[PDB]
Design a protein that fits this description.
The structure is cut from a larger assembly and holds chains A, B and C. Chain A is mainly alpha-helical. Chain A contains one helix and no strands. In chain B, strand 1, helix 1 and strand 2 form a beta-alpha-beta unit. The termini of chain B are far apart. Chain B has one helix and two strands. Chain C is mostly loops. Chain C has a two-stranded antiparallel ribbon with strand order 1-2. The chains are: A mainly alpha, B alpha+beta, C little secondary structure. The chains hardly touch. Chain C binds four RNA strands through helix 2 and strand 1. The PDB classes it as ribosome. Keywords: cryo-EM refinement, tRNA, translocation intermediate, ribosome.
RNA sequence: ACUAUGGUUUUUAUU
RNA sequence: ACGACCAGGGCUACACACGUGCUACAAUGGCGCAUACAAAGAGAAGCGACCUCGCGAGAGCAAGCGGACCUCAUAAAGUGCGUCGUAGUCCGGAUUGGAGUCUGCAACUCGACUCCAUGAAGUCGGAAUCGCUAGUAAUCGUGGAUCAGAAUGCCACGGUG
RNA sequence: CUGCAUGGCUGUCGUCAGCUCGUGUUGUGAAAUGUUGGGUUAAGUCCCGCAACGAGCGCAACCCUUAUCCUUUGUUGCCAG
RNA sequence: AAGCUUGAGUCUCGUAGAGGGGGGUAGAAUUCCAGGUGUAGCGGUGAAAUGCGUAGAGAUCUGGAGGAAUACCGGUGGCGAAGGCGGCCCCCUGGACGAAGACUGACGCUCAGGUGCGAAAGCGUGGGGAGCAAACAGGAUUAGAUACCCUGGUAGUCCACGCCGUAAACGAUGUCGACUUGGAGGUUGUGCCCUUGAGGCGUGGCUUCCGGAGCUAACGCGUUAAGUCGACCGCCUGGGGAGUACGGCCGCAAGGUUAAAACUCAAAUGAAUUGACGGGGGCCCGCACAAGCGGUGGAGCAUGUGGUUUAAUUCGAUGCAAC
């Protein structure tokens, strides 16, 4: 995955590297992550869908 | 493009459909006819209609 | 694979001041007998300076930017099919290959001496209408000179 | 987007 | 006697083709002269120098050292000169033949060597197909064990590269 | 006579990176795991994950040897003076 | 023999949706019709040919005809006892569900025989016939080719009244009721709020995967159970044959129904572990290739296994690992 200027390097987290396919980001799978953080994010996106 | 010289075409818009190998040299051979080809659109599917089409079988 | 190395250390000739002419004694040469090819260095070239540059020290080196390749085509295989892929010549090999086949047909004929068969090869070096042209025209022979395979 | 054709092989101790 | 001494057969017999190697079909060739340089092995019925004679092999006379010293032993290719201008050829060698030279219990049979006489096929090869790394490949030289004698097999050492 | 009894040799994968085992761990169990994933290498080579951490054979260490420097012997080998 | 509301059933205003018909509403190109535009090949294959072509095959415009079929949206989303159901609107209609009140009053469950249902195929009669397509006839390729591949083509594919009830009819789980633990992601009502959130918090109806316990040989099943238990029905008792055989039934019929045995094996069956391997799914090296360059077998020599053979042509070795 890559978005915007990144390129020129570096802007941390580096998720265009070690790709290849399958089973990436597995240290953010099962428990601990998410909770309400994707709720507040997607509510602001829907508050930005108007007109 | 040699069969149309009596029509006096100047500005020309191009449409490209389908994945086949002849899809690029056909644009240079058309430039080599003396027409302004500043409009080129690709309209390849994204499939629609075809009745359904029927498919079945495997893979 | 795992080898690849590469390249060989070469110098200009001690007697002629040329980094090209030291390669010419390895051409039209057999069984390590460079001495038989030294007998036709500059001596046979008085016939060739009549149509190329001035003096024996440039009568081949003027043609250096023509007798070397810069682009080729390469044959590769996939499943049941064969494909002809255009390629660019790499810097160390682009600097080379000037004399590798430029006198290929002087080897065996039965007509005239080596010093004459050398001049009867170098006369076609910048013209390509004589003998063995398939050895030097090949680099465009799957490109511009024949488009039917594409 | 892509190569189309390989049948047959007649047996024995795990000291 | 399935034990093995003597005397002959053989294993080099050919009613089938073939595999690996060699050498040709040659002109950076072949033949004949000139010119320039080695490494490693071998030497007590030894290595055999030098010299003479015999188309020659070799025989006769006979030195020096049992070998870092004396000997096997003009390294060859490379360079130069002479030559054919591509002819079954100055190419090519199998066969049909002669006369000598050596060893050995003995060589007709089933050996080597020399100098000469005849000189075919072969014009780069079915269906196709082998191999490769840097003092190496290529190519041209040298030595040695098996021997009384006797390999294109076997094992090794230089040049040029 | 025959390795279809054996002392003892010897063929080939291959001189491949592979094969086992202590004390654990997995499964109902014979057994499997350790040695399969990740970055890497001539390689089970070196490291990280990870139910393993380690050990022996192969590999490697170790040892010889070549390209440099240093030193002992000199005719019959060598020969700058 | 009287009650109860707690299983079963009913009414208001409302709700999602490929449930089942019939009538409406539309287009595409292969096709067909006419008049134009307009041409040397068209089709297919590794490579071709049968076939179709200058008499226009091939390609295509314009207005008309016709048969199969419905992309998008459509989501690990719905409907239902299965089999089935996905252009769109309407009329008629089956099934299911919500808010708050009002009712019947055990009206419930299972089932021999009955009774009622079929995806696709086969069939009676009348329509249908673009594109494909069993059968059948040719072109390939094969010592076959009768097949895969290519060109044609009848039944079939569709419609309608019917005939025959088949299945991997599949989650291989007979039917019903109840108790037993959590998570993530979909999906549709409704109370209070003009949602003024692009909805929040209570709370009914549905719902795909994960998986604490329990079952199991292992796969699998999992509160949606193959778990823990009752109510009613039918099902096996060793393979090999075989729902085959004998008989009636019902169908025009292939079938469907209940359902063996002489003989034969004294045995078979289920799950996945380690080898062995692939004409697999992936990764890594080697003159295995690429690229360059020099050879081999035909002639004539040197020489030996196997074959021929005198009088013996000694034994042993015949895959990579003999000659």
């Amino acid at each position: 995955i890559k978005v915007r200027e990144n390129e020129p390097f570096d802007v941390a987290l580096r998720r265009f590297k070690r790709s290849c396919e399958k089973a990436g980001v597995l240290a953010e799978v099962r428990r601990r992550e998410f909770y309400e953080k994707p709720t507040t994010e997607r509510k602001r996106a829907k508050a930005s869908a108007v007109k | 493009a040699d069969a149309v010289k009596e029509y006096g075409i100047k500005n020309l818009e191009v449409m490209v459909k389908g994945p086949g190998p002849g899809r690029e040299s056909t644009i240079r051979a058309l430039n080599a006819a003396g027409f302004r080809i500043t409009n080129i659109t690709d309209v390849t599917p994204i499939p629609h209609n075809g009745c359904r089409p029927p498919k079945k079988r495997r893979v | 694979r795992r080898r690849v190395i590469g390249q060989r250390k070469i110098l200009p000739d001690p007697k002629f001041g040329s980094e090209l002419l030291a390669k010419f004694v390895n051409i039209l040469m057999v069984d390590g007998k460079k001495s038989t090819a030294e007998s036709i260095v500059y001596s046979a070239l008085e016939t060739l300076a009549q149509r190329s540059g001035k003096s024996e020290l440039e009568a081949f080196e003027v043609a250096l930017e023509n007798v070397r390749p810069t682009v080729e085509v390469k044959s590769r295989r996939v499943g049941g099919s064969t494909y002809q892929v255009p390629v660019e010549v790499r810097p160390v090999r682009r600097n080379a290959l000037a004399m590798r086949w430029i006198v290929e047909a002087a080897r065996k004929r039965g007509d005239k001496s080596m010093a004459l068969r050398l001049a009867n090869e170098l006369s076609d070096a910048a013209e390509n209408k004589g003998t063995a042209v398939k050895k030097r025209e090949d680099v465009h022979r799957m490109a511009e000179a024949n488009k039917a395979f594409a």
